[PDB]
Design an enzyme around this catalytic site. Structure first.
Site, short mmCIF file in Angstrom:
data_model
loop_
_atom_site.label_atom_id
_atom_site.label_comp_id
_atom_site.label_asym_id
_atom_site.label_seq_id
_atom_site.Cartn_x
_atom_site.Cartn_y
_atom_site.Cartn_z
CB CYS A 185 -0.91 0.01 1.25
SG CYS A 185 -1.96 1.43 1.41
CD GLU A 221 -1.22 -8.80 -4.10
OE1 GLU A 221 -1.46 -10.03 -3.91
OE2 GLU A 221 -1.10 -8.23 -5.24
CG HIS A 222 -6.33 -6.52 -5.60
ND1 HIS A 222 -6.03 -5.90 -6.79
CD2 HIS A 222 -6.51 -5.54 -4.69
CE1 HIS A 222 -6.01 -4.59 -6.60
NE2 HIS A 222 -6.33 -4.35 -5.34
CG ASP A 223 -4.06 -11.61 -9.29
OD1 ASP A 223 -3.01 -11.65 -8.61
OD2 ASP A 223 -4.78 -12.62 -9.51
CB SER A 267 -1.65 -3.89 -8.08
OG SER A 267 -2.06 -4.84 -7.06
C1 HEM Z 1 -5.76 0.27 7.34
C2 HEM Z 1 -5.86 0.94 6.16
C3 HEM Z 1 -5.37 0.30 4.84
C4 HEM Z 1 -4.95 -0.96 4.60
C5 HEM Z 1 -4.84 -2.17 5.57
C6 HEM Z 1 -4.59 -1.04 3.19
C7 HEM Z 1 -4.13 -2.20 2.57
C8 HEM Z 1 -3.81 -2.28 1.22
C9 HEM Z 1 -3.38 -3.46 0.50
C10 HEM Z 1 -3.24 -4.86 1.12
C11 HEM Z 1 -3.19 -3.12 -0.80
C12 HEM Z 1 -2.72 -4.01 -1.98
C13 HEM Z 1 -3.85 -4.26 -3.01
C14 HEM Z 1 -3.19 -4.55 -4.37
O1 HEM Z 1 -2.96 -3.51 -5.05
O2 HEM Z 1 -2.86 -5.72 -4.77
C15 HEM Z 1 -3.45 -1.70 -0.89
C16 HEM Z 1 -3.37 -0.98 -2.05
C17 HEM Z 1 -3.66 0.33 -2.21
N1 HEM Z 1 -3.93 1.24 -1.19
FE1 HEM Z 1 -4.10 0.79 0.81
N2 HEM Z 1 -4.82 0.21 2.64
C18 HEM Z 1 -5.32 1.05 3.60
C19 HEM Z 1 -5.67 2.38 3.46
C20 HEM Z 1 -5.49 3.14 2.32
C21 HEM Z 1 -5.88 4.51 2.12
C22 HEM Z 1 -6.60 5.35 3.19
C23 HEM Z 1 -5.51 4.90 0.88
C24 HEM Z 1 -5.70 6.29 0.20
C25 HEM Z 1 -6.57 7.20 0.66
C26 HEM Z 1 -4.88 3.73 0.27
C27 HEM Z 1 -4.41 3.65 -1.01
C28 HEM Z 1 -4.15 2.50 -1.71
C29 HEM Z 1 -4.06 2.43 -3.15
C30 HEM Z 1 -4.28 3.59 -4.14
C31 HEM Z 1 -3.75 1.00 -3.49
C32 HEM Z 1 -3.56 0.40 -4.91
C33 HEM Z 1 -2.08 0.35 -5.25
C34 HEM Z 1 -1.85 -0.31 -6.59
O3 HEM Z 1 -2.81 -0.90 -7.15
O4 HEM Z 1 -0.69 -0.26 -7.10
N3 HEM Z 1 -4.87 2.69 1.15
N4 HEM Z 1 -3.84 -1.20 0.37
MN MN Z 2 -1.61 -6.54 -6.11
#
Ligand code: HEM
Ligand code: MN
Ligand SMILES: *[C@@H]1O[C@H](CO)[C@@H](O[C@@H]2O[C@H](CO)[C@@H](O[C@@H]3O[C@H](CO)[C@@H](O)[C@H](O)[C@@H]3O)[C@H](O)[C@H]2NC(C)=O)[C@H](O)[C@H]1NC(C)=O
Ligand SMILES: *[C@@H]1O[C@H](CO)[C@@H](O[C@@H]2O[C@H](CO)[C@@H](O)[C@H](O)[C@H]2NC(C)=O)[C@H](O)[C@H]1NC(C)=O
Ligand SMILES: *[C@H]1O[C@H](CO)[C@@H](O)[C@H](O)[C@@H]1O[C@H]1O[C@H](CO)[C@@H](O)[C@H](O)[C@@H]1O
Ligand code: NAG
Ligand code: MAN
Ligand code: MAN
Ligand code: MAN
Ligand code: MAN
Ligand code: MAN
Ligand code: MAN
Ligand code: MAN
Ligand code: MAN
Ligand code: MAN
Ligand code: MAN
Ligand code: BR
Ligand code: BR
Ligand code: BR
EC number: 1.11.1.10
Length: 299
Positions: free
Chosen positions: A30, A105-107, A109
């Site tokens: 993330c 986490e997922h595919d 991304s």
């Molecule tokens: C406890 C809070 C959070 C947790 C546990 C979390 C967890 C994760 C995880 C596991 C992924 C990987 C998904 C993947 O792309 O395969 C992810 C991706 C991402 N997260 Fe977080 N997230 C949280 C909060 C946030 C917040 C508040 C934002 C923005 C406001 C954010 C922005 C993103 C973005 C934009 C991705 C996609 C990245 C990509 O596809 O390359 N996350 N998050």
């Molecule tokens: Mn991913």
């Protein structure tokens, strides 16, 4: 940034500087968690993190209200228990376990490779966790030559990523995750849509330079005029954006899409894993940090 710099004022009046993660620090898949940990708003080592630490860090340093991360927190702890084999209570063991594949986490991304992307043998796996410049470029290429993009543009980005990952992943690996990804699409609009435009809440437009800075640097684009949204973004904004992305008309259809790619997505719900189920091994790579250029305390 350094607390005396005033770079966050008057939106964040208690900043801490950027510090690159060391080889033993734990980082997430993330970009948001990684920027928070790089600043010490959650532990710099990326270990032993409570729900309240996360809530405070997102609210006070990113303008993201508690409602936005409620399901996220639930799912983080579900995955912690799945990966470690026991309840993690209120101390998330580390950030790295969040890259457990086919879970949270997922595919497909926006900026990471898939766990079995381009592997020659079914048992191989790769770093699906650290920022990957080439993957991110495949997202940015959809909006090349532009400074901003809208919901329809975002829908084209995620379609391109799904197509690429479906073609490149080891046969049988690729699994579409529209509900999780498109909450993250909503997250991107919530954080880096251009709030300096008059109609940001009705028709938010992502500033590409802000997006690129946040993802590439895993720090906040204050130097480009960004600040935490005020008032803090709430879950309604995120899931509305998520729905709007998926509702947006597709004017360029990539080939190799999974069945049902174009069209509405399911509401995201709590994850659950069979007690019998053994987690996939986590990629062990050192955490990514920006090197071209390296960042200073105020970047
Ligand atoms: C406890 C809070 C959070 C947790 C546990 C979390 C967890 C994760 C995880 C596991 C992924 C990987 C998904 C993947 O792309 O395969 C992810 C991706 C991402 N997260 Fe977080 N997230 C949280 C909060 C946030 C917040 C508040 C934002 C923005 C406001 C954010 C922005 C993103 C973005 C934009 C991705 C996609 C990245 C990509 O596809 O390359 N996350 N998050
Ligand atoms: Mn991913
Ligand atoms: C973040 O936390 C996770 C979960 O605790 C860590 O992943 C786990 O790390 C342990 C300890 O190194 C691994 O156990 C080892 O397994 C190998 C291979 O089977 C075995 O040879 C050793 O005897 C040892 O038991 C465990 O496999 C691994 N879990 C998964 C699902 O990959 C992770 O290392 C932590 N990351 C950071 C940066 O702190
Ligand atoms: C990553 O962060 C660095 C450091 O802030 C960016 O480089 C700077 O960009 C700022 C504006 O944000 C300029 O004022 C400086 O001239 C730059 N400093 C250096 C050392 O180049 C870099 O652009 C960021 N990367 C991305 C993709 O946004
Ligand atoms: C993570 O470490 C494992 C052993 O500790 C290896 O089996 C994995 O292949 C993976 O190695 C990668 O990341 C580590 C950083 O811990 C590097 O030391 C390796 O060179 C490799 O990039
Ligand atoms: C930052 O401090 C100024 C002056 O005390 C204040 O007006 C502003 O509300 C503060 N910002 C926050 C988010 O508390
Ligand atoms: C973002 O949120 C919307 C509305 O809940 C879903 O329809 C979409 O699949 C994604 O989860
Ligand atoms: C996004 O979607 C959720 C339900 O999926 C709503 O609760 C929210 O108001 C927004 O429309
Ligand atoms: C839900 O909220 C989003 C963001 O404010 C809007 O863009 C959308 O049209 C809907 O009202
Ligand atoms: C989810 O919400 C968005 C924004 O309100 C709509 O465009 C979509 O039709 C779905 O109801
Ligand atoms: C059709 O229009 C959409 C946005 O309206 C673009 O994202 C696409 O590239 C094509 O020009
Ligand atoms: C329209 O846009 C999509 C996304 O960029 C492509 O997959 C397609 O090839 C066409 O250029
Ligand atoms: C590309 O093609 C799909 C169907 O093949 C359409 O749904 C889309 O709008 C675009 O024309
Ligand atoms: C691959 O397939 C899609 C439709 O599924 C087309 O839009 C594209 O032009 C290519 O033939
Ligand atoms: C959530 O649901 C799963 C099924 O995938 C169960 O195995 C689990 O114990 C929990 O009830
Ligand atoms: C990253 O580290 C390099 C060391 O050469 C510096 O140039 C930069 O200021 C940043 O601290
Ligand atoms: Br650990
Ligand atoms: Br524009
Ligand atoms: Br779906």
């Amino acid at each position: 940034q350094e607390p005396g710099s005033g770079i966050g004022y008057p939106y964040d009046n208690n900043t801490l500087p950027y510090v690159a993660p060391g080889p033993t620090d734990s980082r997430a898949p993330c970009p948001a968690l990684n920027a928070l940990a790089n600043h010490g708003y959650i532990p710099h080592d990326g270990r032993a993190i409570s729900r309240e630490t996360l809530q405070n860090a997102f609210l006070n340093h990113m303008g993201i209200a508690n409602s936005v991360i409620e399901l996220a927190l639930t799912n983080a702890f579900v995955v912690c228990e799945y990966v470690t084999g026991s309840d993690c209570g209120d101390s998330l063991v580390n950030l790295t376990l969040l890259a457990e594949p086919h879970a949270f986490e997922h595919d497909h991304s926006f900026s990471r490779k898939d766990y079995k992307q381009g592997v020659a043998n079914s048992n191989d796996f790769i770093d699906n966790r650290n920022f990957d410049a080439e993957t991110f470029q495949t997202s940015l290429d959809v909006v090349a030559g532009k400074t901003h993009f809208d919901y329809a543009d975002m829908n084209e980005i995620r379609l391109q990523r799904e197509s690429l990952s479906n073609e490149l992943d080891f046969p049988g690996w690729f699994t579409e995750s529209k509900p999780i990804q498109n909450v993250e699409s909503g997250f991107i609009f919530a954080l880096v849509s251009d709030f300096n435009l008059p109609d940001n809440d009705e028709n938010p437009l992502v500033r590409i330079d802000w997006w690129k800075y946040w993802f590439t640097n895993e720090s906040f684009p204050y130097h480009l005029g960004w600040h935490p949204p005020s008032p803090a973004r709430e879950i309604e904004f995120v899931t509305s954006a998520s729905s709007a992305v998926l509702a947006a008309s597709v004017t360029s259809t990539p080939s190799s899409l999974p069945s049902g790619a174009i069209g509405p997505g399911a509401e995201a719900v709590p994850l659950s894993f069979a007690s019998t189920m053994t987690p996939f091994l986590l990629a062990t790579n050192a955490p990514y940090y920006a090197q071209d250029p390296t960042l200073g305390p105020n970047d």
